[PDB]
Amino acid sequence: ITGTSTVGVGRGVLGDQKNINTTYSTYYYLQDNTRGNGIFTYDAKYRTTLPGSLWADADNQFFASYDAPAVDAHYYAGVTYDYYKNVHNRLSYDGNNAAIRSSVHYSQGYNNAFWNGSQMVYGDGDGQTFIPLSGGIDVVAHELTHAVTDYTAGLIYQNESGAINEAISDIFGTLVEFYANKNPDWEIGEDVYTPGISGDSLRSMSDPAKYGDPDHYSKRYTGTQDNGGVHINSGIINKAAYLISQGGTHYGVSVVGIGRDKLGKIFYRALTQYLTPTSNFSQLRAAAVQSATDLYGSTSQEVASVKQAFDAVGVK
Ligand SMILES: [Ca+2]
Ligand SMILES: [Ca+2]
Ligand SMILES: [Ca+2]
Ligand SMILES: [Ca+2]
Ligand SMILES: [Zn+2]
């Protein structure tokens, strides 16, 4: 809508207060005009029809419990936009400042979130497996990163290509969590998963096998479930990424860590420059080595650590 940019205040899913960019025209709308062509947040009103209604509020104060998921979807999308701009010089998900749209209150008891090819969508959870999903910054950044991947490498959501697609979203979701920092960790979804149980998460990058996910190529899932294991086999790549950043010894192979900032640079370059829609794990390794080479030289410690990491998870 057309109007005057302003700033409102509200409370997110976890009860934390924050300022959000809104737009005023009779009502106050969740429309942030300060970032690219805008960040827009919609109410799906417990239906599955999308996008729903651009979120309108009478007084620019967002403290109702119904408001919480919208506040966080809207705010964390802004933080994710800032991460890509300030760190990777990328303007929105398409590189030309596309508007970012999210809908919350999707369906009833919906225990997931997703990028649907055009926008992000967030369920409220059923209140025991998940609380509203936009309350996790790693979840928001994971979904938005699917948009980035779709406009760059275009990794097919199937088999090894799909597992790389998912891993990339976990890696950047985590890097964005550390950017905002934020109680950052190497777990996925801990803030919104099982409000009844502390210390757990949906997936672990530091120890995928903690939740039954493979951490070595020999343990990859080869069946047909989950589009050929896209959320399962991502564990192999997440572990490699964790090792490149933080270092460690995994199955007898030692990796010297090079830290998060270089991990992000190497993987962003691999994604935007070298990966294609049908890339497999072995092609990922080649892309990552070539990226590190491009950036730090063929005899760098950085290239050596990338090679070490993939050797350790059994990817040749
Ligand atoms: Ca209000
Ligand atoms: Ca965390
Ligand atoms: Ca996390
Ligand atoms: Ca939990
Ligand atoms: Zn995903």
Side-chain angles (χ1 to χ4, degrees):
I1 56 85
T2 299
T4 306
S5 297
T6 188
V7 179
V9 60
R11 193 129 55 209
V13 171
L14 298 184
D16 61 319
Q17 175 178 302
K18 60 247 278 183
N19 295 306
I20 45 194
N21 293 121
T22 59
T23 293
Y24 178 65
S25 188
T26 301
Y27 284 95
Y28 293 91
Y29 292 91
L30 291 180
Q31 171 183 325
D32 178 353
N33 298 307
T34 70
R35 288 163 171 116
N37 295 335
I39 301 187
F40 298 77
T41 302
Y42 294 81
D43 185 7
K45 301 177 194 192
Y46 307 134
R47 318 280 302 179
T48 52
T49 293
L50 291 173
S53 303
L54 186 64
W55 196 284
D57 185 88
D59 61 6
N60 215 19
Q61 309 254 307
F62 299 82
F63 294 104
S65 65
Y66 191 80
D67 301 339
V71 170
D72 280 344
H74 193 69
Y75 186 86
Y76 292 135
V79 176
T80 301
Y81 175 99
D82 288 348
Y83 168 81
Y84 277 110
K85 177 161 177 271
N86 294 333
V87 177
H88 302 293
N89 292 324
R90 190 191 186 74
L91 299 177
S92 197
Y93 55 82
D94 73 335
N96 193 31
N97 273 147
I100 300 170
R101 308 181 196 274
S102 301
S103 307
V104 301
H105 292 313
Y106 175 78
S107 198
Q108 289 187 33
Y110 189 71
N111 284 323
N112 222 319
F114 59 96
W115 166 260
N116 82 343
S118 298
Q119 63 162 110
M120 300 174 282
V121 183
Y122 298 93
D124 284 327
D126 59 17
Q128 284 255 75
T129 312
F130 278 104
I131 59 182
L133 279 99
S134 57
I137 187 180
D138 55 359
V139 170
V140 170
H142 175 109
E143 303 308 339
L144 210 154
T145 294
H146 281 306
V148 174
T149 297
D150 281 3
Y151 278 83
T152 54
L155 294 154
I156 287 152
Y157 216 70
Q158 188 160 52
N159 302 325
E160 286 189 22
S161 277
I164 293 158
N165 190 323
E166 275 308 316
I168 295 287
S169 283
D170 282 346
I171 293 164
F172 285 101
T174 291
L175 293 180
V176 167
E177 189 170 297
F178 275 96
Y179 176 74
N181 169 49
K182 196 61 216 154
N183 305 294
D185 50 50
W186 292 89
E187 306 284 287
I188 304 298
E190 68 287 345
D191 284 343
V192 290
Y193 191 58
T194 63
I197 302 159
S198 292
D200 64 341
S201 65
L202 194 57
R203 282 188 291 282
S204 177
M205 306 182 64
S206 56
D207 185 12
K210 183 157 74 212
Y211 301 112
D213 292 333
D215 60 358
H216 195 271
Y217 194 65
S218 70
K219 297 185 178 185
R220 67 197 182 279
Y221 177 72
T222 58
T224 58
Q225 261 168 72
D226 184 39
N227 292 120
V230 304
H231 299 97
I232 299 163
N233 288 327
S234 55
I236 294 164
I237 304 306
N238 288 344
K239 181 70 183 197
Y242 171 84
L243 288 171
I244 290 167
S245 184
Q246 300 305 99
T249 304
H250 181 60
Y251 291 101
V253 181
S254 294
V255 185
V256 183
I258 59 172
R260 287 183 326 265
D261 277 1
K262 299 181 178 180
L263 169 70
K265 287 201 179 202
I266 288 168
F267 267 75
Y268 181 81
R269 185 174 183 89
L271 180 67
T272 55
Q273 219 54 55
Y274 296 114
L275 289 179
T276 70
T278 61
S279 293
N280 60 25
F281 281 12
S282 182
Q283 278 155 336
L284 174 62
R285 175 197 173 110
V289 172
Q290 182 66 54
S291 296
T293 295
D294 285 353
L295 291 171
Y296 308 109
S298 52
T299 60
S300 56
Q301 174 64 260
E302 287 76 10
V303 165
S305 289
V306 174
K307 280 168 166 173
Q308 289 169 350
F310 281 93
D311 285 347
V313 298
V315 174
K316 261 61 180 49

